[PDB]
Amino acid sequence: NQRDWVVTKSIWHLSDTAIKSFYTFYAMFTVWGVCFFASMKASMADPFYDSEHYRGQGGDGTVHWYYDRQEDIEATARGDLL
Amino acid sequence: RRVCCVVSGGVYENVLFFPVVQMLKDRYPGVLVDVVASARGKQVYEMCKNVRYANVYDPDDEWPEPAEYTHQLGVMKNRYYDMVLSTKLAGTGHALFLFMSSAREKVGYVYPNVNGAGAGLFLTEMFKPATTNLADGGYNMYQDMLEWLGRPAKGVPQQPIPPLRVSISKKLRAVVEDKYNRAGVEKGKYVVIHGIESDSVANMKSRGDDDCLLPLELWAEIAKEISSGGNGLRPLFVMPHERHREEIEEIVGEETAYLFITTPGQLTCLINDSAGVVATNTAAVQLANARDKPCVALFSSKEKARLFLPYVEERKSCTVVASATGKLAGIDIEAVKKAVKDL
């Protein structure tokens, strides 16, 4: 309503009301069933995960492949055998 | 058969470990031998032909937090070594670190009396005193325990494998050596000078007082008559293995044309592309004496029998000058330049 508070230092009066989405909390979840549209933004090109400046695909592969050092020591042994 | 070495220390006390590795790969043929060392030491294993792949755990601190401890054990154990031969002079605490690595034959060094003499029951072939002074004697126990100890294998299998025979990969031999050489003067006809100042050059872990540096005045006096004469006529390579961007501005070996480079323990190639080398007792001595590379070693006095066993390297090429006063920073620098002027 429009209750009229006569406060002891000023000239107030107010008006309030209660509102809440009745059941459209279902309809908004249905609309957010747009994750079924997560397929057009996945078939798009990958930025660099397919770029030529990338080989090795794990979570530590490219970073910690890093043991061509052993193969290089072996190549050194082979060159010494030559 | 798999083998793990736990050699400790930096560079100069780790470059001398190559004979042991070669003796391993010679006695038991076709053995994968890995190594764990310190960060400054692992840098040396980038020029070898035996080790499979190095690692870095032990500067051998006191606390190291008990998750980097377990994980280290958790990577030694889960590859099933057979004989984890060690150094660093295990007492009774570090012996457990070898023991929990469930191998077959645990051989290492131990403290004579100090630091809890101990040596434990759970070991094998514990031996001689600790501070590991002499060079090319070094692990002298190891080159005897791995010699014919067991079986019809021939009489002691080539007692102390040929001295340091480090190899250089032609990729590093060409590209980085050339790039750093030609940055400044370069003809492959120069002379390397190593001992300058004190940050982490090699420090040798054993020389103690001398060979750490010269006051850079003796170096200037030497260098002014190095290129004097058509012998080299290239060499002004003060070769400062320091933060020398903190030192190059004070090369009183006048900065006119005294070149300079920054290097890790990779300088073996730079030695191999020089026309000689003149340095104090440091890694450069052993590296140059490994190849032909006629060197000139200038350490304090009479320490030769400790730090330089192959007095005659190839033709008595590598020559040594002592100091009658005993302190390195006093020498017949005149006779030094006399000896150097021939090469």
The β-bridge relationship of strands B83-85 and B32-35 is: unpaired
Evaluate whether B277 touches B239 at the Cβ level (below 8 Å): no
**DSSP helix/strand/coil, B279:** strand
- Positive or negative: CA dihedral B67, B73, B77, B78: positive
Are the C-beta atoms of residues B85 and B57 closer than 8 Å to each other? no
Copy the structure tokens of residue B141.
Answer: 């126990």
Distance of alpha carbon B252 from alpha carbon B216, whole angstroms: 7
Contacts of B169 in chain A (CB under 8 A): 72, 75-76, 79
Say yes or no for a CB contact (<8 Å) between B167 and A75: no
Q: How far is CA A20 from the centre of its chain?
A: 30
CB contact under 8 Å between B46 and A75, yes or no, is: no
* Nearest one of B153, B170, B206 to B23, comparing CA atoms: B153
- Asked if residue B108 lies in contact with residue B85, where contact means CB atoms within 8 angstroms, the answer is yes
CB contact under 8 A, A73 and B170: no
Q: Tell me if B283 sits within 8 A of B326, measured CB to CB.
A: no
DSSP letter string, B42-89:
HGGGGS-SS-S---B--S--S---TTHHHHHHHHHGGG--SEEE--S-
Out of A73, A75, A79, closest to residue B51 by CB = A73
Chain A neighbors of B49, CB-CB under 8 A: 73, 76-77, 80
From A51's Cα to the closest Cα of chain B, the distance in A is: 27
- Residue linked to tokens 């920073």: B329
The answer to whether B52 contacts A73, with C-beta atoms less than 8 Å apart, is yes
Report chain A residues whose CB lies below 8 A from the CB of B48: 73, 76
Does B170 contact A79 at a Cβ distance shorter than 8 Å?
yes
**Which residues of chain A are within 8 Å of residue B50 when distances are taken between CB atoms?**
73, 77
Residues of A with Cβ-Cβ distance to B42 under 8 angstroms: none
Q: Residue A17 carries which side chain, given as an amino acid letter?
A: T
Distance from C-alpha of B103 to C-alpha of B81, rounded to nearest angstrom: 6
- Quote the Cα angle for A38-A44-A50, to 5°: 120
Phi/psi of residue B35, nearest 5 degrees: -145, 145
| Residues on chain A touching B52 (C-beta within 8 angstroms) | 70, 73
What are the chain B neighbours of A70 within 8 Å (beta carbons)? 52-53
Amino acid letter, residue B280? T
Report the C-alpha gap between B208 and B225 in whole angstroms.
30
First-to-last C-alpha distance (Å) of chain B:
47
- A67 touching chain B per CB within 8 A: yes
Cβ distance of B169 and A72 shorter than 8 Å: yes
Within 10 A of B125 (CB to CB), how many other CB atoms are there? Answer: 17
Q: Which method was used?
A: cryo-EM
Q: CA nearest A74 in B: which residue?
A: B49
Phi, psi of B195 (to 5 degrees): -70, 105
Q: Are B52 and B65 in contact (CB under 8 A)?
A: no
Residues pairing with A62 in the sheet:
none
B196-199: which pairs have CB atoms within 8 A and are 24 or more residues apart? B196/B238, B196/B239, B196/B240, B196/B241, B196/B242, B196/B244, B196/B247, B197/B240, B197/B242, B197/B244, B197/B247, B199/B242, B199/B243
Is the CB of A80 less than 8 angstroms away from the CB of B167? Answer: yes
Q: Between residues 50 and 89 of chain B, which touch chain A (CB distance below 8 Å)?
A: 50-53
CA pair distance B97, B72, nearest whole angstrom: 10
Nearest CA in chain B to A73: B49
CB contact under 8 A, A69 and B53: yes
Residue A48 to chain B, least CA–CA distance (Å): 30
Tell me the chain A residues in contact with residue B51 when contact means C-beta distances shorter than 8 Å.
73
> How many residues in total does chain B contain?
343
Q: Which residues of A touch B171 (CB under 8 A)?
A: 72
Resolution for this PDB entry, in angstroms: 3.7
Pairing label, strands B295-297, B319-320: parallel
Residues with Cβ < 8 Å from A4, sequence gap 6 or more? A12, A13
| B49 and A CB contact within 8 Å | yes
Q: Do A77 and B49 touch (CB under 8 A)?
A: yes
